[PDB]
Amino acid sequence: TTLMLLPDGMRRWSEKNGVSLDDGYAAMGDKIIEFMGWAKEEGVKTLYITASSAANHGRPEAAVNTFMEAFTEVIRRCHSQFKFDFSGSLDLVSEDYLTELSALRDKSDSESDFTLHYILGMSLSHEVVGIFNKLNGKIPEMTEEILAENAYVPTQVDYIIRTGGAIRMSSFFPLMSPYAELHFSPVLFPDTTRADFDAALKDLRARDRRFGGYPA
Template structure:
């Protein structure tokens, strides 16, 4: 199963508690670890894709963006042991060229250290936007002088694998430019739970509900 999650609600979680937004992001990072470890133990989940930083997130206050970059760097350094212990392969989608050299090196190091892990692939969407991804895929085909077909476009996406189950936390009901192509026939669940409060137990209930749905992929 390919599970994708839009991790939403860190800022609101902090605001409800009279805290700065960065405290919500810190707490959200802890949730990432818990959910990732749960997925690594769940044999039916092979890929977990998390919407970590969108192409639109650069519009946020400069201090918050800088904090998110430092948080990501620190998370990858701290969680390398978790990846290795749980046999998790780390990958990214999106354009990381805008990141600092230090952060890019940390991303590449984490990928290199975990490339042979097999139990779960965790994919972080970083400086990612689905419209941008699809546009880049089409440009690749034009540059290679290949026919523009659905199959060729999919094969040239950052993540050429369809999503089975998409979850968005915080009560918002939209995709926000996340995996638009890959979610063509995804089952979608929207929960009011803010991301820092999202638990493996709630995820387990959603997966059980997912199995009760009949997936027809356009058929009868």
């Protein structure tokens, strides 16, 4: 199973509890590690996590480093437990975070049958723009196969969990996975319990799935 987690709710959890944004993101880091264990136990093989939108990288440098440091900490803690990978709008990410993440990809277990994959600077319009400008005037035509090899999410997504209560995709729709089953939880990400996750998976596993076929 391939699962994509949209872990929304950090700021509002911090505000709710009267604690700093650094605390919220620390709680998010701990919850990601717990969630990863739950996913593993339920047979998820690939866990995509939307670390950021393209819009998030236009925030103040200080606030960018808050989330970046929190997402990187998770990988510093657990890179030996999985194959780590990342992609997205890498042009938006500071060199020092790109160097660290590359090192952590290299230090992670390429023989793990579990993949943890961060999407950074996610956004369809930014994604398409980027792919266009990389290949524009360079190749003779685009095909769905060439699109898929340049897409931020390199494989098909079976399920999406969005926490935090918004019922919208925001910047995080996977370009090449039209038939991903969507589960929206009202729980703020750092409050997610194992029962919230189990309810999500019970819903998702019972859906009448649809797979796509050959392009048009």
